[PDB]
Structure formats: C-alpha cells, structure tokens
Amino acid sequence: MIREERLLKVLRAPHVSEKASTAMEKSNTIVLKVAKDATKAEIKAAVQKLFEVEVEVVNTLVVKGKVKRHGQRIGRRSDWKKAYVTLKEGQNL
Amino acid sequence: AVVKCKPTSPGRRHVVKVVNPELHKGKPFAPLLEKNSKSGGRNNNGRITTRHIGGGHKQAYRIVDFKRNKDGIPAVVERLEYDPNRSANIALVLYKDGERRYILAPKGLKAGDQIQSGVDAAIKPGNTLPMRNIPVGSTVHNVEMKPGKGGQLARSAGTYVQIVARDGAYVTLRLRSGEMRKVEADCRATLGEVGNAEHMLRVLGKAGAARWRGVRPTVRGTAMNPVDHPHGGGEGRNFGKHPVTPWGVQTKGKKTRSNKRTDKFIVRRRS
Amino acid sequence: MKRTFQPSVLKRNRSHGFRARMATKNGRQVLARRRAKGRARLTVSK
RNA sequence: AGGACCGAACCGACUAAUGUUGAAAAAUUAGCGGAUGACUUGUGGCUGGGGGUGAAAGGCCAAUCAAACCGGGAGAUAGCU
RNA sequence: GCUCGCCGGAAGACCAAGGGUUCCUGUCCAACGUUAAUCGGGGCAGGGUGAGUCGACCCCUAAGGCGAGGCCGAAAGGCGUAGUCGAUGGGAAACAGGUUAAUAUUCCUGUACUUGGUGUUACUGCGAAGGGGGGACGGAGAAGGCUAUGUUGGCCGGGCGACGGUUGUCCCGGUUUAAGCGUGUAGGCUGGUUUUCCAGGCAAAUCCGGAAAAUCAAGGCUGAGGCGUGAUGACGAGGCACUACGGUGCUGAAGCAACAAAUGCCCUGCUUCCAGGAAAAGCCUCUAAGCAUCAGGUAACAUCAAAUCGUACCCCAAACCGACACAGGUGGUCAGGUAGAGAAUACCAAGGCGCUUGAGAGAACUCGGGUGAAGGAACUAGGCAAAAUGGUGCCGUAACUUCGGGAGAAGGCACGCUGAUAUGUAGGUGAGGUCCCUCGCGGAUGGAGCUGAAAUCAGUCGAAGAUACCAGCUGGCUGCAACUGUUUAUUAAAAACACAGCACUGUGCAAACACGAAAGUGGACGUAUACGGUGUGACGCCUGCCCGGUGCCGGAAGGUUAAUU
Ligand SMILES: [Mg+2]
Ligand SMILES: [Mg+2]
Ligand SMILES: [Mg+2]
Ligand SMILES: [Mg+2]
Ligand SMILES: [Mg+2]
Ligand SMILES: [Mg+2]
Ligand SMILES: [Mg+2]
Ligand SMILES: [Mg+2]
Ligand SMILES: [Mg+2]
Ligand SMILES: [Mg+2]
Ligand SMILES: [Mg+2]
Ligand SMILES: [Mg+2]
Ligand SMILES: [Mg+2]
Ligand SMILES: [Mg+2]
Ligand SMILES: [Mg+2]
Ligand SMILES: [Mg+2]
Ligand SMILES: [Mg+2]
Ligand SMILES: [Mg+2]
Ligand SMILES: [Mg+2]
Ligand SMILES: [Mg+2]
Ligand SMILES: [Mg+2]
Ligand SMILES: [Mg+2]
Ligand SMILES: [Mg+2]
Ligand SMILES: [Mg+2]
Ligand SMILES: [Mg+2]
Ligand SMILES: [Mg+2]
Ligand SMILES: [Mg+2]
Ligand SMILES: [Mg+2]
Ligand SMILES: [Mg+2]
Ligand SMILES: [Mg+2]
Ligand SMILES: [Mg+2]
Ligand SMILES: [Mg+2]
Ligand SMILES: [Mg+2]
Ligand SMILES: [Mg+2]
Ligand SMILES: [Mg+2]
Ligand SMILES: [Mg+2]
Ligand SMILES: [Mg+2]
Ligand SMILES: [Mg+2]
Ligand SMILES: [Mg+2]
Ligand SMILES: [Mg+2]
Ligand SMILES: [Mg+2]
Ligand SMILES: [Mg+2]
Ligand SMILES: [Mg+2]
Ligand SMILES: [Mg+2]
Ligand SMILES: [Mg+2]
Ligand SMILES: [Mg+2]
Ligand SMILES: [Mg+2]
Ligand SMILES: [Mg+2]
Ligand SMILES: [Mg+2]
Ligand SMILES: [Mg+2]
Ligand SMILES: [Mg+2]
Ligand SMILES: [Mg+2]
Ligand SMILES: [Mg+2]
Ligand SMILES: [Mg+2]
C-alpha cells in the first residue's frame, strides 16, 4: 500500500480552464496538476484519501514546457503532468 | 541432358543448359538445412581479400555427410536433389534405423538404390570402405586424407581418383589434377565417380547469368592507371612489361607452392 | 538535388553520442578536451 | 519463356534554347534512353587516408581528392614579390 | 458575399522520417514578410495533446557490435568462446456513432475482444538449459470465386422553371450501417483408425522417424465472401423554431434490386522455372534429475490487473534537406465521373488553391509562341532548330540472316451520325416455376429481368469523322563496337569499361592468393568439371616464322662466392 507521504505529495494544484469546466460539468471529471513522477494508481489513491471521493479511472498526459523569451534571454518552462480523474457521479466535489 | 535455347533474344542465343529430369522439385529436407549468408569476399577486418565476389541468389546450406561413419547399417536412396552450394548433385538417403542424411550422388545412383559403409561392404558404387579393403585400380571419390576426417579429394561433379598402387600403410592415388599422392591406407573412399558430369557443358550465355552466381566483373590491369596496377598506364594500348599480379608477382609460369611439411606425400607433381 | 546532410537521430547518436565517445580511449580524450575547453555541450546527445 | 517489344510511375541524362551578380554553387522547358532486371528504392550495418572503394573516368570517400578533414611540429623554408 | 480562373495519381487526404509549439484563442504592427497590411508560420499573453486493445517499452532473433575466461600483441591494443545487445523482420487483444476553438480507434454512447494473477469447484502425472513438429519464407505466369467501388432501375422527399417548350419516357437530392458472434460456403491441402516391433532424434519418451499386419476408406486441417445477428439501435434528405447570422435543439421519409468490376481478398494457394529462395522466440507436443495423497495441470465460475513514455501541428512542404516564405530533393498508403488500353491525356467531383509588388502604355530589342505569297536546304561545320510522321482493324511487305529476325519494313483502304438486320443481335449474368436427394451457403431443368460488343446494308451532314489533348518520319551505302548493360556527381556516354566465350598459368587443401608484427579471417563449411592471376573479347573462318635480347621454367659437372671456423 502507498504511504501517506507519497499521497500527500503527488497532488500539486487543481487545473483551471474552459476544457476543465466542460469536463467537470459533463463527465464529472476534474483536472489536476500532479507530480511529474506520479502514476495513475498514486493519483487515484491520493484523490480517494485526501479528497474523500470515489474514483473510476485516471487519464494522464505530460505537458511540455514552452520555449520563451525574456529580453534576449532564451528560457524554457518546465514540463508538468496533467491528470483527468473521473469521479463516479456521486460527490460533485 | 544438354539442350541449347532458341535465339529468341540476344541474351538467349548462346545459352546452353543442363536439365536433369530426376531432381526433386519440392523443398529440401528441412532438418538438414542451415543459413549460409554471404560475405562479398570481405574478411573479419571488413576488407576485400578475394576480388570479384558479391550479390547472387540467396542460398541455404545442406549438411552433407562427408565422413560416412554409420558402418554396417544399410541405407536406401530416397531422392536426388539440387544443391546450390556445389557443382555435384546430392542424394537423400534413409537408414534402416530411421535416420536420414545427404550424400554426394555418385554417377548412376538413382532412387531406390542400396548403399552401405564399413569394412564389410560390397564393391558397389556409393559404398564407402577403407582403401585397405578396396582393390587396386578402382575408381573412388570423396577420398579422405586423414582417417575419420572426412572426404576432401574428388568432390566436384564428374571427378574421381584412381588407386594406382598400394604398399604398407599408404596407398598411391592418381589425383584429378594428374598428381600422384600418397595417402594413409586407413582413409576411406566411396566407390564410383561423382555424378553430374555434364556440368562443364553449360554455357551461361550472358553476363547476368554469372551475376546470378555471385561473381562480379573482372577489370584488366592494362585498362587502369599505373597508380593502381603495375600494368596500368600508357597513351593508347601499351603494355611493354612482363605480366604480374596486382601485387607485383609474376603471373605466367612462376610457381608459388612452398610446403616442406607435406612435400613428403607427393610422389610426383601434376607437370 | 540531394544534399549532404540527411538527418537521422539514431545514426547521429550511434556515431557521435556520449556512449559512443565513452567506448574508446580516443573518444574519452575528445571528451576530456571538450571539458578542458569548457564546452557547454559535450556531445550531440541532447 | 525472355539482361524480349511499345509505353506511364520510377531510375537516368543524348540534343537545343533559356538562365550565367540564376528561381538553382549544375536547374527549367521541349524533345530523349532504360523501364521483370547486371533493375530500382527504404531502413540499419561494414570497409579509413599511401588507406578504403572503383563494370577503371585518376572516378568517388560530406559543395574539398595525382593522396580527405581537424589539431599539432609551426613563426617549416622562401637566393622570390 | 456573388461572379471568373487553376490543380484534381494533386497543387486533395493519411502515415513514417525529420522539425519542435509553427496548432487554437485574445491582442499588437516598431523589427521580420522582397510592396501596403487591419493580415501572418512575426511580437506578447493564455489555452491545447486523455489508450489494457495504436506505437514505443517488452519477448525473439538478422547483418553487425560488444565480449567473463581465452589466444595474440613494445605499451596502446587486436581477434574471439560462453554470453549479451542489435529491426529494416516474427510475437495477445476494438469497432461504429457523437462530441472541442484546438484531442480523440485515447473523451462519451452502444456493442466487443486479449493476456496474466487471486479464490472456489470438479477431474487429473506434472515437470527442462534437453528431443520433435510448427513458426518458415524465391521469381514468373494463369484461371476461377469475391469484395471495395461505380452505373442504372425501383422507392422516398422536393420541383413545374427569368426566353420557345417542359404532368413527363421530365428535373434535383437521398437511398448508409462496423468490429464481434453464429453458420462454415466457392476453393486448397492430405487417406484415416488400431495394434506389434526397431542399430536413429547425444539420456529417455507415450512424442518424431522407420518396419509389419488388422480394418474402414471417408475422416481431418485451412478458407475469401455471402446470410443471420449486432441493429425496434445509430445515421439520415428535409422540415419546425431560435441565432449575438457562428451556430443550437427536436422531428425526421425511403433506406431495395440488377448489372459492371479492381493492381485489393481467397492466395503464405495453384502451375511452372532455375539463379533453388533468413533466424530465433511466442505455440503444440515428448519425456529427464525430481516431486510424489504436496506441487503442477485441464476445465467451469467470480474477482483483480494491464504500469511508463508518445499522441498538438507541418509532413512533395513557407514548418524536413537546400544560408531565403529558394521553380530543386524527400520512403509508404488512399485512388470517384465522362471519354480512353491505361495510375497516359482532356474536362470535372470530393477537397484545395489564384503562387505577398501593383497601375498604365502598346517604341527598338530580348524571351516564349501562332500564321505566311512564290521557292524548298539555295542556310550551315552539320537539316542545328523547326516542320513533318503519329490510332485501331484489315490487305500487303525486299536485300540479307545466326532462320529468331529484318518488320510497325515499305505501301494501301475503312473510320462521324441515323435507321434496319435485331421495338437490343452474338454474348455475359441470372429470378420466379418445376424435379431429385447425401436437406443444404445442395443439385438438374427453367429462362423472366438486366447488361451488352463487332459487323453488313441503306440513309445523312461537313472543306475535313484516328477531327481536340494524345500519338513512329521513312528509305539506301559505309566505319567502329557482337548484343542488354557501365563511365569522367558538376564541359567528354564514346570507338572507352564490362560482358558471355577463348587461352595461358598458378593452386593437392592448414591450397595458391589477400587482410593482418600476430592470433586469426576471407578463399570455402568450396576440393582441380574447384579457386586465383593475366591477356583476349558473341558468332563464322582462322591464328603463319623467330628462344638471338629480357623474363619465366628445368638442370647442377665445372668457375666464382656470405656468415662461420
Ligand atoms: Mg479511459
Ligand atoms: Mg577473379
Ligand atoms: Mg573474364
Ligand atoms: Mg584510362
Ligand atoms: Mg607502379
Ligand atoms: Mg600507340
Ligand atoms: Mg613498343
Ligand atoms: Mg527489356
Ligand atoms: Mg520502353
Ligand atoms: Mg550516372
Ligand atoms: Mg526533361
Ligand atoms: Mg528497349
Ligand atoms: Mg588519363
Ligand atoms: Mg565531393
Ligand atoms: Mg603526398
Ligand atoms: Mg620545427
Ligand atoms: Mg610563415
Ligand atoms: Mg513561437
Ligand atoms: Mg494559425
Ligand atoms: Mg505603418
Ligand atoms: Mg512592410
Ligand atoms: Mg504566431
Ligand atoms: Mg498515455
Ligand atoms: Mg552475433
Ligand atoms: Mg571482440
Ligand atoms: Mg578479457
Ligand atoms: Mg535480446
Ligand atoms: Mg521493426
Ligand atoms: Mg486537428
Ligand atoms: Mg457490391
Ligand atoms: Mg502493379
Ligand atoms: Mg493528429
Ligand atoms: Mg513566395
Ligand atoms: Mg521549394
Ligand atoms: Mg525518389
Ligand atoms: Mg494527369
Ligand atoms: Mg510585344
Ligand atoms: Mg518572337
Ligand atoms: Mg508553325
Ligand atoms: Mg512560306
Ligand atoms: Mg504555299
Ligand atoms: Mg518539294
Ligand atoms: Mg549547301
Ligand atoms: Mg553557302
Ligand atoms: Mg532535330
Ligand atoms: Mg514539332
Ligand atoms: Mg453504326
Ligand atoms: Mg572511312
Ligand atoms: Mg557497344
Ligand atoms: Mg546500350
Ligand atoms: Mg561530366
Ligand atoms: Mg554529357
Ligand atoms: Mg583456413
Ligand atoms: Mg580489348
């Protein structure tokens, strides 16, 4: 079983966007910025424990950082992980 | 059977082909096959060490019994086959105990024939005996040079070795090249001549036919520049020098054999 | 017209990559040279 | 059946014109040869510089080849400008 | 927005490589864009890539790489065994419909499938680094059966026409449905079953191979498509109604048949040829040491698992390789209509574009084209270039020849349309009815319906009917090279190189020879009907004299002659 520290660290922030709102309203799916090393099982366990809801399935993808510019200084944002987690239509968290 | 093609195209006019109705037409005996991939004439350094090799048709290797060490058990010829690895035909043989092998097909060997190896075998074509038990003047092929090593002499289509003399532990053979050699009397040989003697009569007819066999074109030394052949150079057709190899050794009559170890076994050179 | 540079990431890594350099004494020498010069990128790897 | 025939793709490059500070450090246009074969093509691999490879032109080996490229001996030497 | 023009085997669509945010939205026009710019692949900000089934990762190997020991080598290192890596190849599993500004076989809806684990039950000899089978493989050719797809009819909905006519034999549009499951068909392959024995498969084996009898000879395996189900579902012209004129919601008919037909599928088949056509694992099976009322295995039921990485966008291109938003290059897949042999060509569909300087004028001259009186190569180094020929079917076709050719030699005639033969012929396809039974995706007759060349005769229009695009100029004498090929990437394609054939010569196998201070390797898992070197160059008739010079081969009496002593 996954420990408490791991599950306390794997969730970073709730993502906010129009697609997130559409998914939440339609399929009761919430979108989370998670740890880069977090697997679907850890995400599910952390959402079940720390959020106290019930989970069907986790969808994950990695967002690549954008190569940007700051006054003739090339710079790159980091990669982060995004999780589509489906809550089984009984909580509306 | 030797037949010439009709000249319905320039590449077919001079083609002469060797067709044998008795060769098997199906796939060969698979448990006796190996993969035998091509080298192009390159050694393990990756350098061309033998020129004019490359391409040609993919071939599979057939394990052939050159030793014939299953003495005393009769075997029956099952079928004659085509072997892309050599000029001779090979014959699949079934032993009484259920073991199958490929042998070099001697002249006249046909399906249903009976063969045997050992000291107590009859003097029939296809039968293998130690040369101590073979009468003087016989005609043999697949001749051993060491006992139990396997046949190494007279293995090409139409070739044979005559037993000239015999005294003591050695016999005197007459080789296909015309050379008289001494061989230990306990080396084994197969009675008869190697089959497919009509092999020399084939005419390839065109360049691509030789390319199918994996031989690349030869470029004359006199056609290149002196930087890459001793024959090279000149304004027009010029030679003015004694012929040599690409590496400078005379190539018209100069002898290259130097083996003092085996010189004792040669009664007389091919001359 | 076909030009000389025809990219292939696998061939690039196998010919000039970090592990190919580390495989021989002379490749290790080129790595040491580039470290002494302070190249910000030792090889083609990234 | 065929290194068979005519002819697209595909592979080439015989002629002419244009272009020649080009659209292009070798092309365009109109014609042209081969087009089931010694054919052509993708991917990967091997051969290393007095060495490789070459159906042989001293051809090709990264727009470089009668001895590649980079670094070093090195401020070579220069009765010459 | 309406007109016009261009591509349409692409200038449309989708992958792989490669690139990396170029994708979508808001905003801005300084610089970049060969002009302007409100626009942009430009700047700035925010958003966007969802997988048990697709790919990688993974299991398995090829070429090849590395390589414990090992062999070799002044050092560095080189080769290689057992091993271990290495795809461009083998190996489990998902389809339709809908949805975003941008993702979808990944989200949703519906219906599936695969491999492994955990438990329960029943039965039961399981077991591998070993054996056997399988996986497992070429070129070409031909037929038959299909489907994708298309056309037409039938049906459903709509229409009655800006100018003569248009209730009809008229016009427009639609007529779609997957994987999976069940059936096991056209067709391909092979004789089954049971005993007894055995010098083989390194041991063993009940498995494979072999020998001998009994008996029945129809059993077994593979197999496109069709049909049923999936599916009373979904989709669906069109209508109703809103819209901030993007788009949103609901309703929603018909949803059949015949014919034609692939380069796709049956087919990893069949026939045929010689140049004789990977490997290993997954898989099935056999036992061994062993375990032995335990493990293990077979089968049914339930539960659990299928992680990680990729997924936007370009991809014949303004995003890749070419310094550029560069007339260049870049592997694979899809493949509609009319004409046509055709993926040629012309005009079009779906879809996508008008190529990021324009406006005038209508000089010389340059470029790319059209036509030309009379003459017709008089041009010129040379008919360079241009002009000309050009299809199908039929008649006819010389010297010479290696008997195949030459040959499409040359040359000549017909060709459109309408009607009749014949309200659609020859042919192809094929329903209803009937008959039989191994009863079914069966067979025999039946010919409805559909589709449909070629020709003959008459008639008819034009200057012209292979009317456009497309599409051989032909003949005669002669040099060289036999021929197909190859070559100076970028001024030379040839008479040069190669070539099949010929000859000489070396080479007896630890071969000669070549790469290597060596170990080793190629030659070759070949063995003199083989392999290397050299010259010549299909074929026909032939290949004369000289061994004094130089080379090579053979000899070893005599003269000379090194280290050595
Ligand atoms: Mg899901
Ligand atoms: Mg040779
Ligand atoms: Mg030759
Ligand atoms: Mg020359
Ligand atoms: Mg020389
Ligand atoms: Mg001369
Ligand atoms: Mg002379
Ligand atoms: Mg041809
Ligand atoms: Mg042609
Ligand atoms: Mg070329
Ligand atoms: Mg051209
Ligand atoms: Mg031709
Ligand atoms: Mg020259
Ligand atoms: Mg170059
Ligand atoms: Mg030099
Ligand atoms: Mg110096
Ligand atoms: Mg100087
Ligand atoms: Mg950007
Ligand atoms: Mg855009
Ligand atoms: Mg302005
Ligand atoms: Mg501007
Ligand atoms: Mg932008
Ligand atoms: Mg994923
Ligand atoms: Mg290996
Ligand atoms: Mg090694
Ligand atoms: Mg070692
Ligand atoms: Mg492996
Ligand atoms: Mg692969
Ligand atoms: Mg998209
Ligand atoms: Mg159909
Ligand atoms: Mg084809
Ligand atoms: Mg996409
Ligand atoms: Mg432009
Ligand atoms: Mg371009
Ligand atoms: Mg190409
Ligand atoms: Mg076209
Ligand atoms: Mg003008
Ligand atoms: Mg003009
Ligand atoms: Mg004209
Ligand atoms: Mg005129
Ligand atoms: Mg006139
Ligand atoms: Mg005239
Ligand atoms: Mg004149
Ligand atoms: Mg004149
Ligand atoms: Mg001309
Ligand atoms: Mg013309
Ligand atoms: Mg007519
Ligand atoms: Mg003359
Ligand atoms: Mg020629
Ligand atoms: Mg030619
Ligand atoms: Mg040139
Ligand atoms: Mg040229
Ligand atoms: Mg050897
Ligand atoms: Mg010659």
Q: CA triplet B121, B123, B106: central angle to 5 degrees?
A: 105
SS3 track for C1-46: CCCCCCCCHHHHHHHHCHHHHHCCHHHHHHHHHHHHHCCCCCCCCC
CB C39 within 8 A of CB C21: no
In a 3-state reduction of DSSP, which class is residue A20? helix
CB atoms within 10 A of CB B240: 7
Give the technique used to solve this structure.
cryo-EM
Beta-strand pair B90-95/B75-81: antiparallel
Domain map of chain B by residue range? 1-113, 117-194, 195-271
Domain count of chain A?
1
Q: In angstroms, how far is CA C22 from the centroid of its own chain?
A: 10
CB B191 within 8 A of CB B140: yes
Q: For strand D, which nucleotides have at least one atom less than 7 Å from a protein CB?
A: 1-4, 24, 26-27, 37-39, 43-48, 52-58, 62-63, 66-67
Amino acid, res. A47: V
| CA of C10: nucleotide with nearest C1' | D44
φ, ψ dihedrals at B219, nearest 5°? -105, 125
Q: Which residues of B156-174 are buried (b: 16+ CB within 10 A; e: fewer)?
A: bbbbbbebeebeeebbbbb
Nearest residue to B177 (alpha-carbon basis) of B200, B154, B195, B157 = B154
Rounded distance, CA A76 to CA A62, Å? 15
Residue with tokens 């079934």: B94
Structure tokens at B169: 């532990």
Domains identified in chain C and CATH numbers: 1-46 (1.10.287.3980)
Question: Cα dihedral sign for C30, C31, C33, C37?
Answer: positive
CB B7 within 8 A of CB B203: no
Nearest residue to A42 (alpha-carbon basis) of A81, A79, A78, A16 = A81
CB B32 within 8 A of CB B101: yes
SS3 track for chain B: CEEECCCCCHHHCCCEEECCCCECCCCCCHHHEEECCCCCCECCCCCECCCCCCCCCCCEEECECCCCCCCCCCEEEEEEECCCCCCCCEEEEEECCCCEEEEECECCCCCCCEECECCCCCCCCCCEEEHHHCCCCCEEECEECCCCCCEEECCCCCCCEEEEEEECCEEEEECCCCCEEEEECCCEEEECCECCHHHHHCECCCHHHHHHCCCCCCCCHHHCCCCCCCCCCCCCCCCCCCCECCCCCECCCCCCCCCCCCHHHEEECCC
In a 3-state reduction of DSSP, which class is residue A87? strand
Q: Which residues pair with B184 in a beta bridge?
A: B170
Structure tokens at A5: 């520290």
What CA–CA distances, in Å, run from B78 to B20, B73, B100, B189? 17, 16, 9, 22
Domain B1-113 listed as CATH 1.10.10.2520:
no
What CA–CA distances, in Å, run from B67 to B71, B76, B85, B146, B151? 11, 17, 18, 11, 6
Amino acid, res. B139: T
**Which residues, in sequence order, are CB contacts of A2 under 8 Å at separation 6+?**
A41, A42, A45
Rounded distance, CA A41 to CA B226, Å? 75
Neighbours of chain C (3+ CB pairs under 8 A): none
Structure tokens at B209: 């036919």
What CA–CA distances, in Å, run from C27 to C14, C33, C35, C36, C40? 13, 10, 12, 14, 17
CB B155 within 8 A of CB B104: yes
Q: Which residues pair with B104 in a beta bridge?
A: B90
φ, ψ dihedrals at B171, nearest 5°? -120, 160
CATH topology of domain B195-271: Ribosomal protein L2; domain 3 (4.10.950)
Rounded distance, CA B36 to CA B141, Å? 25
Domain containing residue A39: 2-93
Rounded distance, CA B74 to CA B114, Å? 7
In a 3-state reduction of DSSP, which class is residue A7? helix
CA torsion, points B213, B219, B221, B222, in degrees to nearest 10? 140
CATH code, A16: 3.30.70.330
Structure tokens at B153: 């002499």
> What's the alpha-carbon Rg for chain A, to the nearest Å?
15
Return contacts of B248-255, CB within 8 angstroms, 24+ apart.
none
Residue A85, judged by CB atoms within 10 A of its CB (0-12, 13-18, 19+), counts as buried
φ, ψ dihedrals at C36, nearest 5°? -65, -40
CB B108 within 8 A of CB B195: yes
Q: For strand E, which nucleotides have at least one atom less than 7 Å from a protein CB?
A: 17-21, 43-45, 47-52, 62-66, 76-77, 79-80, 87, 100-102, 106-108, 132-134, 136-137, 198-201, 208-210, 273-279, 306-311, 320-322, 328-330, 402-404, 482-484, 496-501, 504-516, 520-523, 525-539, 550-554
CB atoms within 10 A of CB B16: 13
